[PDB]
Design a protein around this ligand. Structure first.
Ligand SMILES: CCCCCCCCCCCCCCCCCC(=O)OC[C@H](COP(=O)(O)OCCN)OC(=O)CCCCCCCCCCCCCCCCC
Ligand SMILES: CCCCCCCCCCCCCCCCCC(=O)OC[C@H](COP(=O)(O)OCCN)OC(=O)CCCCCCCCCCCCCCCCC
Ligand SMILES: CCCCCCCCCCCCCCCCCC(=O)OC[C@H](COP(=O)(O)OCCN)OC(=O)CCCCCCCCCCCCCCCCC
Ligand SMILES: CCCCCCCCCCCCCCCCCC(=O)OC[C@H](COP(=O)(O)OCCN)OC(=O)CCCCCCCCCCCCCCCCC
Ligand SMILES: CCCCCCCCCCCCCCCCCC(=O)OC[C@H](COP(=O)(O)OCCN)OC(=O)CCCCCCCCCCCCCCCCC
Ligand SMILES: CCCCCCCCCCCCCCCCCC(=O)OC[C@H](COP(=O)(O)OCCN)OC(=O)CCCCCCCCCCCCCCCCC
Lengths: 505, 613
């Protein structure tokens, strides 16, 4: 199977990136690009050979490919990997964002750049493993391993303007939030493994076997909450979001960590792949609380974004507001909302990526991220201001940008299940418009509010233009023709939706 | 009619070309791409129209691709032409070509000549999709599009922060209407699972037979979307401020397009409003209230553009009254006639402002009738059409049809609102005309001439006369016929309307021509200073919205500025640090204390072992 190589190539390339700095400080970047290019090519090959569009839901579990190798036999833990329309779509996004993460940090050719790329490649290897792992321990291991590289990238290669103290403070907060939450999930994985043994007599960590574990209402609820705590920190779900704005602000200014370790939806997939299938009844009775937490994140994130001054922290809070819609959808039991969640998870990744990459490029010219020191940048630059407007139009969810397809599909499906929550949630589209236009008016429109913004700035390079324009084409195509993506995730999302509904009944 | 898509592709191509030009092309080349794009779309519309009447006015459908398909949710990117669409397509591309041609002269020498045409091209394409869409979700892609393009053009002069504020307000107020529209789309699909206009009205009767309770909510939410784009109560606080964009934009986003979308929507979904009569009547009441409220506001405005903004609000009000009285054909007739005189008035207003060196106050100007003659004639013909001067102007025929329909259907109270609004229209329209052109010169306007400026002006002038009343919109087949008034009763209304229209103009002359003493006395009167201030601020809806929405929102933003919930989740760490320092207080290097610590531990361990034995 090739599934194992979607995780190995990134890891092997990371080692090569470090061992090739001896041939020059301009070599590691090419090794990283080839590494991510090969993983992306392999992902596309799997897409063109799986016939996902013609796969009909046969019921969980339903994998197009699977690999199993003994890892820790004593505990029945193995390297079990499996692909599906949902997982495939998340792996190809990781490959695309990984190539862009390498291209964005291309002018960074300082010493120890090999270790930078090693950490970047390993963050991506872990993310791909999280989307492929079907062994509960492998899932947890990949969930927690990807955090160590991220910690050192935010603390040692973080915002060039921030002091070491501020960067470390942010990295520690991110790690403690995430590793501790992940540990609460291990406690629940271990409890599920023991409840299975006691109820049946088998010792397994395989998701396929633990899918129907006879358990009481109380234990199922506690086990479900344990997984949710881990998926609430990475989504994020308010009030476990404080770590996000800080990490984004102190992360490599170029935007590499932002795209690789913060824009891949490993928590939304986790809620759809494990929480909903493993604990169907508990998820159904927690739906009200989860959906209301999402509504709060929609308005709280929007208000927090409006008052940010820092452009990168503004974009960071917009993510909390947008992910609230996905949380509401995951707990509706509607195929339309689930399919829309998949589109939004992909669209937000592309729209947020563009904003984060453009933010880094802007810093390279004005050496500031404070919007109070910008203004009239539309008349001082050649592309950045116009392209930032596009990504903000997509962020507010303009029809024709792909973010609209996901957001409206979620609302249409959610309305059929929870009408009142859908009505209040739709008003979030007005708040989005407020923060989206606020950022454009406070940075590119009006008059220069500082001297640096009052001089013609260097123009965007071909590399910068290519990566940003690629994201523009993808968002527009996803907005006008989203069917090819919907046809790939239909079987997987159908299996999950049926399981949840049928199990609750 | 197979070229129906070209009416969108051509404008869309113009946008991409002019956007990626980034201002590198010459003004002439940029104009050729901008005006030619809309011009070719208008030519295609003409050929499509010829084929439509040739094939017996049969509805044509052009399925392009399936946009979204998830189970029973099957939305299609399909276009449709039936007559209501043809009328709207003709106005959008036709009047849209003339405004583009005029804009070529108006924006000469200004920065962003290319970006302006790029946005106006995207606006046209969005409006065409809005009108040709066969389903509500595709209509949304085009409803929201025109809103974006309006935001982009209202704030075209980005250097001025005030223009940006006006653009943001427009987007927010209209987006609140778009949220209401969305609710309707969410309900209709949950109830019918179609969103296709034809299928919806075909499957609606049976589903709501037991109770149309959910149908009323959908039609009410459809009205919410309409009152937003059409600037009707309670979402009309954005039109007057939207007069910050280049004047040509005002003509497009008023007369031609945008403000007419709400009328098209209620007209396209008439079959559903008919099943909800109470909501349909509310459409009439909203129009009557807006036409009256907007007329008074226009009578006290001092900016030429703002008088023409509140007049559009009153004129869109008449079309809304027409829909509520079930005079569907009359509403579309007035939309078309309005697209002529209002565009003429706005384009003429631009010529006046440019001639008066960017002056915009009606006072501070004067005696321009001698300096700018053609522009003065355009204002006279446009103002007469707006005031519905009898027989000579097309507005007379379009408005009388609205008033006739209301009376024919028994809506006497609404017809009376129309009659009093007509008197107000004459007063506010000629007050401005008698103050800007008649009187003593004060600015010394510079003659504005050349084709690209006069041609659009003249073509709209002819269309603004009775000649425009001859362009009968093809509607039999799409919209129901209106109850016919008796000939004798019709003549009475036509005479009354004419007398009211004329008397209005005569009073306007006597009041705002010469020393203007009586008006000054009333204006300086305590009642006058109070009512004048109230109407000048549009009855104070803007003030109320600032105190109920903007101020509360900004206050909560200031309160949460420091992420309170994050600080709450930092308590586990403040307690940890404090506990650590307290525990380290036992780490005094004193050994005797260390020995005592083990003594205390022994007593505790032994005590517990005995109490837990
Ligand atoms: C079930 C509950 C709901 C779900 C929870 C999900 C997981 C949440 C995990 C995080 C819990 C809250 C943590 C809040 C603080 C986060 C950052 C942190 O640990 O300390 C940051 C703080 C900053 O200060 P410093 O680093 O010195 O920088 C210079 C001065 N500002 O550094 C300090 O000076 C603090 C020193 C102590 C830091 C470690 C102790 C704080 C956390 C204790 C454990 C809390 C409970 C975790 C249980 C597992 C997860 C549920
Ligand atoms: C942050 C994300 C994590 C939220 C954690 C808090 C969830 C609390 C859920 C709860 O109390 O549910 C109780 C009950 C269903 O659970 P059951 O097993 O029957 O009772 C024992 C639960 N420990 O169901 C109920 O009675 C639910 C009624 C509402 C009670 C909880 C409200 C929590 C609101 C704040 C959430 C944050
Ligand atoms: C923060 C920013 C502002 C947020 C404002 C939030 C307002 C929330 C309003 C909720 C209204 C809910 C309601 O009226 O009841 C639910 C109603 C009917 O629910 P349903 O289950 O469809 O009825 C049975 C048939 N299916 O649901 C519906 O179907 C009604 C859909 C339209 C709701 C319109 C809300 C605004 C009304 C005034 C304009
Ligand atoms: C191969 C597959 C093909 C499909 C995918 C490719 C299509 C994408 C092309 C269009 C989308 C992006 C728009 C262009 C991005 C940047 C281009 C550019 O440089 O345009 C600049 C232009 C004005 O230029 P200028 O006056 O010079 O000022 C800018 C700085 N100099 O300023 C601008 O134009 C501002 C840029 C954003 C404007 C609004 C964004 C539009 C969003 C699309 C939503 C569509 C909704 C309406 C559609 C209805 C009709 C179907
Ligand atoms: C019109 C809006 C254009 C908006 C910008 C371009 C976005 C294009 C995104 C993809 C559009 C969908 C598409 O190409 O699908 C294929 C379709 C023909 O095949 P289809 O009918 O889909 O096959 C049967 C199953 N549906 O293709 C078609 O039917 C295409 C018809 C329209 C062609 C538009 C050409 C690009 C835009 C030109 C102006 C700029
Ligand atoms: C019945 C059912 C429920 C009905 C609910 C109705 C919808 C409510 C939705 C919430 C709307 C809240 C208000 C939104 C705008 C608030 C923010 C604001 O006004 O900020 C000022 C704005 C941006 O300010 P700033 O970022 O500082 O600008 C920097 C420029 N260099 O700069 C500006 O100039 C922008 C001004 C925007 C004004 C918007 C006014 C909206 C009025 C809505 C009326 C709805 C009536 C129904």
């Amino acid at each position: 199977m090739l599934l194992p190589w979607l995780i190995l190539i990134p890891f092997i390339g990371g080692f090569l990136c470090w061992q090739t700095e001896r041939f020059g400080v301009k070599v590691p970047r090419w090794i990283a690009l080839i590494t991510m290019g090969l993983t992306l090519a392999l992902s596309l090959q799997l897409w063109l050979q799986g016939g996902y569009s013609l796969t009909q839901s046969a019921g969980i579990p339903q994998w197009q490919s699977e690999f199993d190798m003994p890892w820790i036999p004593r505990f029945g833990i193995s390297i079990h990997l499996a692909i599906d329309g949902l997982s495939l779509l998340m792996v190809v996004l990781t490959g695309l964002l990984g190539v862009l993460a390498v291209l964005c940090s291309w002018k960074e050719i300082e010493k120890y750049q090999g270790f930078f790329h090693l950490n970047l490649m390993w963050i991506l290897g872990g993310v791909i493993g999280v989307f492929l792992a079907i062994d509960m321990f492998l899932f947890f291991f990949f969930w927690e391993m990807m955090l160590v590289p991220m910690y050192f990238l935010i603390a040692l290669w973080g915002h060039k303007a921030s002091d070491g103290k501020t960067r470390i403070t942010a990295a520690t907060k991110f790690f403690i939030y995430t590793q501790a939450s992940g540990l609460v999930m291990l406690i629940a994985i271990l409890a599920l493994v023991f409840v299975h043994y006691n109820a049946t007599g088998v010792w397994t960590f395989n998701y396929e076997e633990l899918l129907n574990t006879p358990m009481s209402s109380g234990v199922e609820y506690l086990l479900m909450l344990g997984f949710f705590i881990a998926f609430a920190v990475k989504m994020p779900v308010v009030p476990l979001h404080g770590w996000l704005p800080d990490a984004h602000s102190q992360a490599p200014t170029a935007g590499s960590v932002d795209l690789a370790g913060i824009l891949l939806k490993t928590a939304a997939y986790g809620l759809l792949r494990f929480s909903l299938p493993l604990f169907p009844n508990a998820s159904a009775e927690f739906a009200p609380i989860a959906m209301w937490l999402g509504v709060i994140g929609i308005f709280y994130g929007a208000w927090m974004a409006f008052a940010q001054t820092d452009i990168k922290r503004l974009i960071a809070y917009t993510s909390v507001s947008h992910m609230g819609f996905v949380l509401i959808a995951i707990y509706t039991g509607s195929q339309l909302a689930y399919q829309g969640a998949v589109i939004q998870m992909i669209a937000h990744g592309l729209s947020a990526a563009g904003l984060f990459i453009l933010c880094g490029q802007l810093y390279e010219r004005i050496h500031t991220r404070d919007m109070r020191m910008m203004g009239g940048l539309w008349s001082k630059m050649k592309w950045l201001p116009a392209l930032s407007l596009f990504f903000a139009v997509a962020t507010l969810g303009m029809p024709g940008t792909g973010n609209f397809v996901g957001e409206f599909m979620i609302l249409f499906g959610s309305f059929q299940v929870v009408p009142v929550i859908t009505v209040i949630s739709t008003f979030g589209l007005v708040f989005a418009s407020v923060y989206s236009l606020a950022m454009l008016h406070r940075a590119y429109f009006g008059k220069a509010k500082s001297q640096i913004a009052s001089q013609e700035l260097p123009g965007m390079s071909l590399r910068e233009l290519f990566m940003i324009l690629l994201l523009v084409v993808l968002l527009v195509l996803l907005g006008f023709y989203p069917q090819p993506i919907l046809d790939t995730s239909h079987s997987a999302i159908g299996n999950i939706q049926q399981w949840f509904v049928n199990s609750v009944t | 009619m197979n070229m129906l898509a070209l009416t969108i592709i051509l404008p869309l191509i113009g946008f991409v070309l002019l956007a990626f030009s980034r201002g590198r092309w010459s003004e002439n080349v940029s104009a050729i791409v901008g005006v030619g794009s809309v011009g070719l779309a208008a030519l295609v519309t003409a050929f499509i129209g010829v084929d439509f009447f040739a094939n017996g006015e049969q509805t044509y459908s052009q399925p392009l691709w399936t946009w979204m398909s998830v189970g029973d949710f099957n939305i299609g990117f399909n276009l449709v032409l039936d007559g209501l669409s043809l009328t709207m397509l003709s106005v959008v591309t036709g009047v849209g070509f003339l405004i583009h041609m005029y804009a070529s002269w108006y924006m000469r020498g200004e920065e962003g000549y290319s970006r302006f045409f790029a946005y106006t091209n995207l606006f046209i394409a969005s409006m065409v999709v809005l009108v040709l869409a066969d389903n509500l979700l595709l209509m949304y892609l085009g409803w929201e599009g025109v809103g974006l393009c309006s935001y982009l053009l209202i704030g075209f002069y980005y250097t001025d922060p005030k223009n940006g504020a006006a653009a943001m307000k427009a987007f927010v107020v209209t987006r609140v209407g778009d949220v209401f529209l969305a609710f309707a789309l969410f309900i209709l699909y949950n109830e019918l699972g179609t969103l296709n206009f034809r299928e919806m009205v075909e499957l609606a009767p049976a589903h709501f037979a037991d109770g149309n309770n959910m149908l009323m909510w959908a039609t009410l939410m459809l009205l919410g979307g309409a009152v937003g784009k059409s600037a009707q109560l309670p979402l009309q606080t954005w039109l007057a401020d939207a007069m910050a964009g280049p004047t040509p934009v005002s003509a497009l986003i008023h007369a031609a397009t945008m403000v007419t979308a709400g009328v098209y929507l209620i007209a396209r979904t008439h079959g559903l409003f008919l099943m909800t009569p109470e909501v349909l009547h509310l459409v009439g009441i909203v129009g009557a209230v807006t036409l009256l409220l907007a007329g008074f506001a226009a009578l006290v405005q001092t900016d030429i553009k703002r008088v023409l903004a509140y007049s559009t609000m009153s004129q869109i009000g008449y079309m809304f009254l027409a829909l509520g009285v079930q005079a569907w054909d009359a509403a579309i007739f007035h939309l078309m006639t309005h697209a002529f005189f209002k565009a003429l008035l706005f384009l003429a207003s631009g010529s006046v402002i440019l001639a008066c060196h960017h002056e915009q106050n009606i006072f501070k100007m004067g005696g321009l009738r001698k300096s700018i003659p053609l522009v003065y004639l355009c204002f006279l013909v446009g103002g007469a059409a707006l005031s519905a001067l009898p027989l000579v102007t097309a507005g007379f025929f379009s408005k009388d049809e609205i008033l006739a329909g209301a009376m024919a259907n028994g809506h006497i109270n609404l017809m009376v609102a129309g009659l009093v609004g007509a008197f107000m229209t004459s007063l506010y329209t000629f007050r401005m005309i008698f103050i800007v052109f008649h009187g003593k010169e004060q600015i010394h306007a510079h003659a504005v001439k050349g084709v690209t400026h006069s041609l659009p002006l003249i073509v709209l002038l002819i269309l603004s006369t009775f000649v425009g009343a001859l362009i009968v919109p093809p509607l039999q087949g799409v919209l129901p016929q209106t109850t016919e008034l008796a000939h004798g009763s019709m003549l009475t209304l036509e005479i009354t309307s004419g007398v009211v229209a004329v008397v209005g103009i005569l009073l306007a002359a006597w009041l705002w021509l010469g020393k203007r003493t009586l008006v000054t006395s009333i204006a300086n009167s305590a009642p006058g200073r109070l009512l004048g201030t109230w109407w000048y601020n549009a009855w104070g809806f803007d003030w109320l919205y600032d105190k109920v929405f903007v101020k509360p929102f900004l206050g909560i933003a200031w309160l949460l500025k420091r992420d309170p919930l994050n600080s709450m989740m930092n308590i586990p760490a403040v307690l940890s640090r404090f506990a650590g320092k307290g525990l380290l207080l036992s780490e005094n290097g004193y050994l005797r204390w260390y020995v005592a610590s083990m003594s205390i531990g022994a007593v505790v361990v032994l005590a517990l072992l005995m109490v837990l034995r």
